[model samples]
Target chain A: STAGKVIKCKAAVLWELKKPFSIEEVEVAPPKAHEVRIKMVAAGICRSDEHVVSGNLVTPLPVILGHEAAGIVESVGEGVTTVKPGDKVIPLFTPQCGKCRICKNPESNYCLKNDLGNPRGTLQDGTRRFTCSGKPIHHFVGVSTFSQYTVVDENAVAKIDAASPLEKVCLIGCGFSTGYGSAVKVAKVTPGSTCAVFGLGGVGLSVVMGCKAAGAARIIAVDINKDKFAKAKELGATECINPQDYKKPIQEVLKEMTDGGVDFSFEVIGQLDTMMASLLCCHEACGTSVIVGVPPDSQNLSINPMLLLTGRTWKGAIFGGFKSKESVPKLVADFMAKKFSLDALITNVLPFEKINEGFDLLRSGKSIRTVLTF
Target chain B: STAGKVIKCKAAVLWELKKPFSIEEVEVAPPKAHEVRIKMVAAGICRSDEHVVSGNLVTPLPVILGHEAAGIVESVGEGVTTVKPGDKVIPLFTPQCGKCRICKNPESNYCLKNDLGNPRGTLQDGTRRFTCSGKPIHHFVGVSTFSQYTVVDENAVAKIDAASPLEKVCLIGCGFSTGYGSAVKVAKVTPGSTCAVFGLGGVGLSVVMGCKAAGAARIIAVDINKDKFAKAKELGATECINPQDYKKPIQEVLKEMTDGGVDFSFEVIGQLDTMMASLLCCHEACGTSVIVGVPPDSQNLSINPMLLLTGRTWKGAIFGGFKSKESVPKLVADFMAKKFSLDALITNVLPFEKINEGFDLLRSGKSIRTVLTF
Candidate 1:
């Protein structure tokens, strides 16, 4: 019924930096050529969504801020062939154009046409899709999954399996896949190798799961809070360490425990100090330190070139280096195969109307992931 | 016989930081347990030795300063088995013990027992073998090849082919292997790929050769010294760029020339600015920037984590990530195979007394590599 027409929908919109999201009625325009319109089914509360609100990750104002979600295709524009009405899909913040140079390389998942570093929240036609009060409401990385109805470029629309459970699979649209792929893909963590995960958040726990799945012998989970240890242990962490319990630096503590250092380390906390610690806590000659969490937009990390010269590889990837449209469906299929379970990760589920409370649970560290159903 | 007797020899002693090397008569003690005494044949005047003189690298004072060299094993201490008397050898600054975790891993070249970061400038027994007037002169990087005779641990020495040219193969001990291996072994440069090398010095020119050997389609060499362009081109650079001639930032110029940056980039100059420039001049989505240069010990690079998060990888390697004892001999044999020629690399060949003149050529950018023959 919404094909080629304007649809009125509810969305969480940020009117200003450092302000709470306001529930507003917005009008989404029809998708242009090579675009698809998605009706969001379930969305997850992620730290990245909180980053914009905290003024840490600066972006355009009056923007819809959620990028991790599962949705159903409501309409398609001219030249769109990948998805159609009624197809289950996950919106990609990092799109795969399939025609770009990046998409041609096997080792890379960075599609050139993607909205990864795009400052303009517009589509290929250079215009916004959603408008409120006759004023333009910008898109966040082109997905804008916070909205009930969002129009995205067809390249960013990943068609998933029809049987995918929307609530649980929504986390895979971002955090779960990002942390998992960082271990399995980016670091290529070897069997019998030791790993350390910094910050026991959603992404960090997912990293621990990835290490465990990759046959890592020792998964050392680190966090300031002891409360997260039980969940971490259940998710395959061999042991958990609280930084407050030690008088020495975290890197030294890890070195002492692992003989020299862990083979791989993940920094799921978006802080300069943690990022540096992640690089130092791994083996100097052969360690791979992956940065999964994103820090402030303007903040920079001060790293000595000698650290890398000694053999440690410091790298970071978005969406765990998964090429959307090509890899997201595979991940969904893996979930269906019971390769890993998302049951424990889904600690809370709430109506989309209680989205503010969902944010509260995340802010207080009371929930692993809070899914909001439309 | 020099087997168990101390031998008096001439060595270039660094008596003070920021001063010229003093050609002083020093007493070279016989090798201790698990060590070899080498009669120096040829040594390359590398920038690292100058790094100590300029106080940029910051090592112990009054040390014999040279690492890249080829020599004849004149004697061996108890338990030395790799090299006997009259065998040609290359002293490894980065040793491979073959027993450590780093050596056991195929992907790694870092040896835990190597004196890479050792501050004492002493051997495993915590003692110096070179002395002047009873005052201990530290052995630089465990292989002070600047001396007429240098004592090195057996584990840190690699025996090479008896037919190898000492003058050419000596550079392989550090600069040649470091630069070439950086491109082939470290970056794994693909055929028909575009590459950029910053600072057309000994190592950078070696990187240029490496790129060509790796079958790179285009090699762009950058340097402030236009005088170094001819040598860089002879080595394999398709084109040379002098940053001083361009008004724009070097990174921007490189990005513009390559139509969105090169595939692989090397920072060969030991400066912080060139290091940052190397990272920015590579393709944002799939580019890999390698730090092959050594900057001041006090300096650090301030990089935005988002730069790496967007898919660009920043890394570094010492000795071109090659496992020294195992790979060095193979590289020498490869040189014997005519796989790549080092004929153009040795721009100057000076006698032992002209070591200071060799240093002057490097400081003035007048030579690609200067060999000091003993």
Candidate 2:
């Protein structure tokens, strides 16, 4: 048992902004009180992680960089009753503290204790749990799963069913769940409605899947890369559009085709222009546009209030508005039941050592999900 | 009955921008096909009309303003079936054609045939119904209640109950209805929920009444002018706060006071700053902010997408999302039933010749609703 000891393990550490991740040995501490130590089995390379490396999102240097992953809890600290040793788990990117006002409300999933609030690169206790070469390495969103072994607060990790496939279900930790829940839970995409998804990445495709599952009549998949079109269509997109094909703005083209615009639209790319397009491409009077992507920090959106004043709803959420603690396990069980296909989202896989290759595939847009295993 | 003949009457015509109203004798033409001519009974001086007077909103030169009014139909044109001579009615600022796509949808009240769509400042048929000194005068939002007699398309008129007090219920035409319906219908203000209302104009006070009427537990009224506080309290505001009193942003002040912000918020002042304050002052996760104010033309609202990404709903609508044709008469009936008070909204009454005085009262923040009678 690793309950009261340090575990030295390999991790992909980001040394600086605009630099590639370097695989190195890191010392991970044991779980403190009400904390759990996890041995990561699989981690997915997500665009959000790219946000940090590309300097679009700011964070502490020399940090373990993965948030979307599934692992096994190897140890538990004092008073940790939720999960025990050997439990299959997914460390949450957005933590849920049950005592917070947001967690207590049925309609809200955002907790006041989230990492986005303050002390961003550390755990709830304002301390780092990983170190290398006598230098402290910050945790990423309290779930630094880039390291094989990491420590997390008990309230921020979910123990899943034993039958789950860690390699594939890892997508549920962030990307897939975010997109699917955006359509199903946030927008509540109604039956026989029309939808437009701006971006063809794994998250956008998941939105397409959710739209189809909700019985949407037409799902228009939009992307600059034609390579992602077939996969999107296979998942459920009824039509595909490339913005480059039109002289006018994409919003105008969509309005022309869908008779004033689609019923629902989603911004799955972090680009500001696409976010604006997504908001405008929906019906002016009754459409809903959901921002599912993480935009660059400090960038403000300039929109005419007249757009909203005409009756369109502008909204968004983290983890697709899901209450992390309560939702992750149920989603895993649903995944295990063959209700939806997470396998289709995984286009490539790489061993833990080739962490840079995973990121390369992600940057090239050649892969939907390049999951790495330890 | 004055059908098929021109009537020479007094009207407030805006001959040019940055100038006071021109009280002139204008020729009121007979109604055209599917049109109704009404003799104005009561008109309210609203901020929207002032949008034209200040040239903050662009409209054609030499136009008649005033959209909120109660009138008696003086004549009817060919095939006019909805309303006729001797009928008491309220001309809709936002017309509901009932056959347009927006009118067909239960979730929307914006009609495709409204003035904002195209050929703005004129009736649906592309011609003016008034001529001042032989110069063709444009209509404002197809209502032009500033004129002693005005012509409107039959689809844009609502016949109210015969026993209704036209002077008091005229408030239901615009300010009161827009603000009240913003709470009850658009935001759906629930029982015991906390709310914050920005601006203390007639419309803003009406929002306070709506919140109290909808059973909101606490209502916070915000304004720069402290003079409006007493009237706001009289209308059911639980607390009154002047934003100038707080050194920090008003949103911070509200969050501290309401124990982490309000459930619903409204921006009734057309200024962009108040709009941003209204959006940020609501609860981050489950709160909703409705943009009830009409910002200045050519002005855009700059907001951080993170504000919406955190799960707050940003939405708005014309006339508070009420289907004008269907809602106007029903609201008038409610006013007659004393279900809610409309008397409190009218702070002053001025003769039609004192139109400039009414506007002066509004601009100086000395009055709520200044009812003008011809």
Candidate 3:
């Protein structure tokens, strides 16, 4: 372990927005105060990374592409005692600085101490560790897991039991935790209640599992792609709806099917229409709509304020409201215990060289998740 | 007490949309089964009535224009046990059937049993009591209180103590109860927290009183008209802001004032922009925005889902989330106990003949609430 020293490595780097990532040799600096250096084990290519590359969400240029990842701790910086070398951990885009007001609150997992200012493209120290061809490479969403190694704040990594598979548990870093916790924690889906989830991707399927775990009577999965319906049903959706088959808005169809509307609805499509439909599909007086998708900066969702006026709540969940450091380990344990199945979510696995093909599969709706191996 | 016969009375009738109300003689039928007949003492002209007249909210036209009124029960119908002759009461547009699923739940005051059919312009039996020139003049929100005498369902009236003045308690039937309960019940504004209220009319001012009664540390009142500030201040608003004076959106102005954002925000203005601003002006983690105003049916509120994703909640309160019959009596008691102030909200009192002038004063921002004596 090269403690307090720089290590050179290879990483997928994006020099500009709307461009393909270029594999290049990059220099990685060792962990500084309160930081931990990690050797990347496995990284999931999340939809949010696609958003950053597509210019839907703006980010600083020349940055690493991945955020959902599992890794082994290489070394710890000064004052970092929570994790050490050789520990298996998942890097978090949403950190949990236990001392912050947000971290201290049991209801929220958002930490106030990780505010990296303006672009938020650097570590807690507001500096980049990756340098390629003499130019500094920025970090994406604090984790920068597309690299062979990442240097992050101690609070940005959650230590998990080594017995849990790193490749599978890495999904918990973002999508799995975000979707599952949205149903379990944020929405608090009650037993014998009904739920509808829009967009049958990895996150939507994760929501189905969460609802199933919560003992929902009916879980309706909606998507334009009917092929995803099979997997959604296997994952716990009681019914499947293809929006293209409906003559009216999907919300109307859902409302009619559920005898008014579902008890809970979730939008995982990251589109304005799905968000509106998700809210409109909730029972007027007491249903809840939880948003888990990451929409573009330029996009805004519109709805009749009457929806909420009738007692239907409109809320959004980030990381399924799981405080990374406090809850991630529990999620990993749950995964190990088979309390919630994770194997059914990953549709494809590829080497780092075929990462662009994974993105293509995602765009084509042919894959739920694609994990890349270094 | 005309318990079994029809009675003729002077009522302000809207014969067509956007036309001035005509003071005409209208026939009021005796209370049917489960109905109650009352002699109207005082009625308040609420903004929703204005919307009905302006065609912003579609309703069966050629109908009565008032919903907020206090009266003395003249008679009870067959099987009616809730109130008797000579009892003081307030007519409720949102009725409470305590046995219904909605009434049984703590989250909503809405009752499924009161579905007044098609246009919501009749009693539970789908019949109109008021006849104008031999044509069946529709009921407005099941309570045609614009008339000097009216017939309503027993479930649609809340009996209050005789000690409460009909003139002031009439405000409690709609605006006061709505605003007060929004803070005290819906948003559940915590003690020592902060609040921001948009629109300084009757509802907004009532919100200020509710927040103050809840022991809020600071209350910011917002309006385009600066004249409402004095009354707002006297009613316990800690600060007042004229959005017209701000170069940025009122949400930005509020964020700067509250360090991050207020603990709770309310939009009583009913405009799309104001609704969005109210949601955006809440603290990212735990703040809530409660919509109190009724926006045009055609209009939709747009917001960034990220606002809710960051932990803010967007909700709306109907009748201040109070189960009308169940909660109105307690609110009246609170008013009697001096637990909150309601008299300050009644800025003007006019005779029924000058009811149109009251609407004009409301439109011109010259009054908070205008009570009309028949």
Candidate 4:
């Protein structure tokens, strides 16, 4: 509990209109109630961050961006009990209080009282401890780990073994969990099942990992990006191709390839065409098509009621119904136990000053995950 | 079995355009192969039969339309072994060939080979035996029980107690099983859950019965006909309302009544408005809406894809997944045990000659379930 001088750190803050964030010196606050201040050693450039920077998600301007981050705890606030100072941790974008109705029940993922729109990273009690200039600036998903130092709720910061590198284990917070959980938890992908996934981004690749974990016999990865299939294959996609690879469109190609259709299909990129294509690939019993990515608010998805009647199901899942207090720690443990290839997900690492450069790689679809090193 | 002359019975055959089925004399055939000839003690006037006569459900001209019937077995075929002569039975509209994949599965109500389109009610090794002018006339659904003596496959007859009145138990064949099994089997209504059933016709009332049987706390009945609510109430409806009773619309009314919404809802009326209202009333997390009514081909249901993502489910079920071999016997056993109320569903009874008149009563919403007594 060093109550002397306020720490200053360099962070990439998006300041003006139509321009990317710039690395600038910012005052970092000391931790508060049940909070842990993380000296973020590595923070991943996520697609969700891109959504914010591009104004798709509508975060407050000059907000700290990265949500997929892993770092070492430098200090602990009063009443902080989960992790001690100097503990290695991955900060979750969403935190579970562990006492909400959804958290208490085994059947739900609807965590209450965490709103990113508020911008002020405060607990349910309503007191802003994070501020930029007497006015509270925004924190993306309360973690705001894009900066050198980040403050988070204890439940949001899952302590991990130091054996795992911050650059590699950083993505376990969101990408792996969202994609994997979308298949395993949301769709409940069964063994000997055939699965098709649209979009070969980090989330889509992770869904491939999940299908493999669930013992799927045929894992077909669909993407528009030509070279993304290689990353998907590394994540255990048995069949990888651009949807346009086959002579026919995705629907016809999937039908012919799987004899009839797949048992489960996932639309990782939420587009009406992709959603419909995913639905068409489901088999006789009408396999479930899970929607993991949030589409633009203006776009609406349309599907024929006859298709749903024919035994198909469509479902949307958030954070992969992630129980941060439970799943995040286990994911980190799995990373340490070497059950998952977490390190391979980190395609590039950049210094904190080049954070804007890292976003360029993400926007270009060249990096699976780019971690900004502090 | 007693050997007797082939009996001439009064029957209703749809012989011409825009004309009701005319009661006429037809030659009866003896039970052959794995078939049984039953003395049709009583047959229920079902909506499917009404649909067929109204040209909503396609059937060949000169078709006898009665699938919901109860009778006393007159004789068994050469290979029939399940029941002997004089056994009381309920006829199954869709026969369960036990060898079929759906029929063999414990969870499925679907029978694989219900080739009703064939019009020739023959087994897998096809050969039609029903004839009139040396050319075999088509039989509707497998059990054309509109006649005093109707022939049925051994797989289509479920033997029950003779003491149970045929006038009442006849509905257990189609309408009873369909509406009741829809709530019990298809929806699997959870105890203390809320449910709204649209169209309080014979099928709708039966759904009310099934929901009560499943221990639903709030069974809300919706119908345009206010007079139908009394029967729906008798079958354990906690609340009843006319669709016109709502301040705004059915959807708004339902939303106001149920805080978040009902756990399960059903559209028994084959209309777009009611179907949409039924689906929209389901609560998030675990709400479900089941569509039992067959609407016209020109009509289709539409809902925003976002609703599906929020965790609401919609399913269209057939025959209520009625497994004649499994569920019929169980329903019979339950009825005999005084669990299901079959007699209460019967509102009118008429002779075979008055079959058309019974349909008129059904069309006018005056009869819950009208039976044609032979």
RMSD of each: 1.6, 1.9, 2.8, 4.4
Tens-place lDDT per residue, model 2, A193-250, is: 8999999898999999999999999999999999889999999999999999899999
What are the runs in model 3 whose C-alpha is more than 4 Å off? A16-20, A98-101, A104-106, A113-120, A336-338, A351-354, B16-20, B98-105, B112-120, B284-286, B301-306, B351-354
True contacts kept of 1: 0.82
State the lDDT of candidate 2 residue by residue for B1-374, as single tens digits: 47789999999999888788989999999998899999999999999999888987788878999999999999888898888789999999898889977898788898887886343788889888889878899999889999899999988899999888888888888999999999999998988889999998989998998999999999999999999999899989999999888799999999999878899999999888989899999998889999998888758878788888888999988898899999999998888888888887898999899999999999999999999988
Give one digit per residue, the lDDT tens place, for model 1 in A226-319.
Answer: 9999999999999999988999999989988987889999999899888888889998878888888888877788878888887878888888
| Candidate 4 per-residue C-alpha lDDT over A1-374 given as tens digits, one digit per residue, 9 for 90 to 100 | 54423567777777653588877667777777787788888887778778776665566666767888889988887798889888899987767778864466464554554554334445444443345554555666778887888777787778888787877778888888888888888888988788999988888888999999999999999988978978888888888878665678798889888856787899888677887788788753346778776554455554445455434556776667677767887887887777888766778888978887888898888888887778
Report the Cα lDDT for residue A332, model 3: 92
Judge candidate 4 at residue B363 and give its lDDT.
88
In model 3, what lDDT does residue B323 have? 90
Q: Find the 10 residues in a row with the least total lDDT in model 4 chain A.
A: A116-125
Please give, for residues A1-374, the per-residue lDDT of candidate 3 as tens digits: 47778888889988887778888898888888899999998899888889888887778887887988899999998788889799999998888878865676567776775532235689877788889977898898788999889998998999999898888889999889888899999999989889999988888888998999899999999999899999998988999989999899999999999877988999998888888899899888878899888777877766778878877778886788888888899999988887776788898999887788888888888899999887
TM-score of each: 0.97, 0.96, 0.93, 0.83
Best by TM-score: 1
List per-model TM-scores for chain B: 0.98, 0.98, 0.97, 0.92
Candidate 2 ranges with C-alpha deviation above 4 Å: A117-119, B117-119
Chain B structural similarity as TM-score, candidate 3: 0.97
Question: What is the C-alpha DockQ of each candidate?
Answer: 0.75, 0.77, 0.60, 0.33
Question: lDDT by residue for model 3 over B226-344, one digit each (tens)?
Answer: 99999999999999999989799999999899868898999998888899889889888767899998888857766767778777778886888889998888888888998776788
